[PDB]
């Protein structure tokens, strides 16, 4: 088993529905301009602030991601190849760092 | 055991012992008589 | 080990007697032959419980015991029951002659320095049943 680290595909500025799996509000039944909006973002004046680390819209992807415990299917010395089960982070032609599995 | 603010000897085999800043009753006959203050 | 009262003279009555002491493992056909011959001289109907020191291989041997005292009181009283609480209702007070006749049952196997001290012992049950002396 190996762990593969790479830079995931970059999605750019991502809304809360895509970035955090927020549930969209009603598409009909009176909804005014509030279909994919994040909804409420806090309480009323007792905290009086937005808390740090809150799930909102922003940059998604294009970040270091590791995938752990992927099976090694084939190790080919002559052609300098390693076949690993499953998808690994990043686009085709991007740098990957492959380590032995730490958990195994 | 039973945790109650009032701990007493429930029979003649009970013994009061203070262990970790906590008063306890240990009984060598009836395990129901195990008590701690709390 | 269990013990129960035994009828001395009766053989094969259904309610009271069977596991009295023969079920402990004593050969009753010999025990209630020798002891029945002994109690033939004893008055009619005195259940007398002896101490048991026996084996479990068809062999036995019994020690002597004096007959009871509580059973004998109710002869002259004319009543064969008991009161719920003595000292309030009585079954008829009996005489000192009868009390000493009952006492003489326990006189042959007592090691006391003075035999008169047994008077209090015998009259304890007299007071605990309602046979107050005059």
């Amino acid at each position: 088993k190996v762990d593969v680290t790479g830079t995931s595909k970059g999605k750019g500025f991502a809304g809360t529905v895509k970035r955090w799996n927020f549930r969209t509000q009603d598409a009909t039944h009176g909804n005014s301009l509030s279909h994919r909006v994040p909804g409420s973002i806090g309480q009323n004046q007792t905290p009086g602030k937005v808390f740090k680390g809150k799930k909102m819209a922003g940059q998604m992807g294009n970040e270091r991601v590791t995938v752990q415990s992927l099976d090694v299917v084939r190790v080919d010395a002559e052609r300098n190849l390693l076949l690993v089960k499953g998808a690994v982070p990043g686009a085709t032609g991007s740098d990957l760092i492959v380590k032995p599995a730490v958990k195994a | 055991m039973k945790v109650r603010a009032s701990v007493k000897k429930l029979c003649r085999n009970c013994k009061i012992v203070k262990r970790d800043g906590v008063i306890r009753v240990i009984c060598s006959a009836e395990p129901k008589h195990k008590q701690r203050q709390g | 080990y269990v013990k129960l009262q035994v009828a001395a003279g009766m053989a094969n009555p259904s309610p009271p007697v069977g596991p009295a002491l023969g079920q402990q493992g004593v050969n009753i056909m010999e025990f209630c032959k020798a002891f029945n011959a002994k109690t033939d001289s004893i008055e009619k109907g005195l259940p007398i419980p002896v101490v048991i020191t026996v084996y479990a291989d068809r062999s036995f041997t019994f020690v002597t015991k004096t007959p009871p005292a509580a059973v004998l009181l109710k002869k002259a009283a004319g009543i064969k029951s008991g009161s719920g609480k003595p000292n309030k209702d009585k079954v008829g007070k009996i005489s000192r002659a009868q009390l000493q006749e009952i006492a003489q049952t326990k006189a042959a196997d007592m090691t006391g320095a003075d035999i008169e001290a047994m008077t209090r012992s015998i009259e304890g049950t007299a007071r605990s049943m309602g046979l107050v002396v005059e």
Partner: protein, 419 residues
């Protein structure tokens, strides 16, 4: 415990009639002093007052003349009818169900009884939320304006429902407690018999006589609240649990019956019901009907039952006996409480009632049977005891099959007489 005018109506057309003597008994048990007892006759209830306008004016005049404090109807009447009677006569009005709830409130001494009675009162009062007289008046407003957001009637309904749910939750806690107390016996092969019936049936004193344990009994209606369980001896199965129970009355309130779900768990799960009946009561058939009706209401009519006619001493020149069905199973028994007649026959019928064994074994061994004494006398008993020749001892025994099996497993079972 105040002055009252009593009201009764002869609704002979339908089965919604009630007994005036029983009503007076309930009133006196409550402790109320009756200054007058008014009677009427109608076909169906008047919607406005529950009585005619003329009869309502008569009860108002009676209250005015006698200076009475309350008016006790012998009937269920609606909140609007109560309101209209209150408007005619300033004195307060108590329904039959209100009187019963008040009696139970006075009688309740235990935590469980208090909980059940307050639940019943809370439901009965939640029915009577019709007048919202308050000093805050109607809260005017509009769109986007401050305010409570809801009506006071709805708010009060919310509050009553919430507190009713709270009483209920503590009641299922009490049910869990009583269920643990029950489950102590069910893991054992316990026989459990619950004696139940109409009030003043003598069933509490029957319990007292059978169990030799003191429990309250008198000529007071609804004397007993909550059950009492006691160990009793029966020839066949040995140890059994006799349970006393709170009595019934014609037309128990449904809210009260629902409240007593925790208390009635003994009758729900009883292995036998002893339906104790006052033979001297001229309304004996009505008592049977009412008791069966409440049993159906609590859904406990499928349990085995056995009727027990008490108070035969009030019947002239009668001796106790047992009436038996076509299947030769005792379905009815007669007896008396004080004289003790019929008690041994009740015990014999109880022996016959529950059992699954009639075979009797005969045992004998060499001198290795003190353990047999202990085990037999441990499970049940020695049925027929005697000795025979050569020191052998011939027992005859009859104990349940479960006792047979456990004895066989425990012992070497070399006696080859007991299975």
């Amino acid at each position: 415990g105040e002055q009252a005018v009593l009201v009764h109506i002869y609704f002979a057309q339908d089965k919604d009639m009630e007994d005036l003597q029983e009503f007076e008994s309930l009133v006196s048990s409550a402790g109320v002093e009756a200054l007058q007892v008014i009677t009427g006759s109608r076909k169906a209830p008047h919607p406005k007052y529950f009585v005619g306008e003329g009869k309502a004016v008569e009860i108002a005049e009676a209250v005015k003349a006698t200076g009475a404090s309350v008016v006790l109807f012998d009937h269920a009447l609606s909140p609007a009818q109560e309101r209209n009677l209150e408007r005619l006569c300033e004195c307060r009005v108590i329904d039959r169900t209100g009187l019963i709830l008040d009696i139970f409130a006075q009688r309740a001494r235990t935590h469980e009884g208090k909980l059940q009675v307050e639940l019943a009162q809370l439901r009965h009062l939640a029915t009577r939320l019709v007048r919202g007289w308050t000093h805050l008046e109607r809260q005017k407003g509009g769109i986007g304006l401050r305010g409570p957001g809801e009506t006071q009637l709805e708010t009060d309904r919310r509050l009553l429902r919430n507190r009713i749910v709270q009483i209920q939750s503590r009641l299922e806690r009490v049910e869990k407690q009583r269920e643990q107390g029950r489950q102590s016996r069910i893991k054992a092969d316990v026989p459990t018999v619950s004696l139940v019936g109409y009030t003043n049936a003598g069933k509490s004193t029957l319990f007292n006589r059978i169990t030799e344990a003191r429990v309250y009994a008198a000529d007071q209606l609804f004397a007993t609240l909550d059950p009492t369980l006691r160990r009793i001896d029966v020839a066949d199965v040995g140890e059994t649990v006799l349970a006393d129970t709170v009595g019934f009355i014609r037309h128990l309130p449904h809210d009260l019956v629902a409240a007593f779900k925790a208390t009635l768990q003994e009758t729900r799960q009883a292995t036998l019901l002893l339906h104790v009946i006052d033979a001297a009561d001229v309304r004996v058939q009505e008592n049977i009907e009412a008791v069966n009706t409440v049993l159906e209401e609590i859904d406990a009519h499928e349990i085995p039952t056995l009727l027990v006619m008490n108070k035969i001493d009030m019947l002239e020149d009668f001796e106790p006996r047992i009436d038996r069905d076509e299947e030769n199973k005792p379905n009815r028994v007669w007896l008396s409480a004080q004289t003790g007649a019929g008690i041994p026959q009740l015990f014999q019928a109880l022996t016959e009632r529950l059992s699954g064994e009639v075979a009797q074994h005969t045992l004998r061994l060499p001198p290795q049977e003190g353990r047999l004494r202990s085990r037999f006398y441990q499970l049940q008993a020695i049925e027929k005891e005697w000795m025979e020749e050569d020191g052998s001892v011939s027992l005859q025994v009859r104990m349940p099959i479960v006792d047979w099996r456990r004895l066989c497993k425990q012992e070497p079972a070399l006696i080859d007489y007991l299975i």
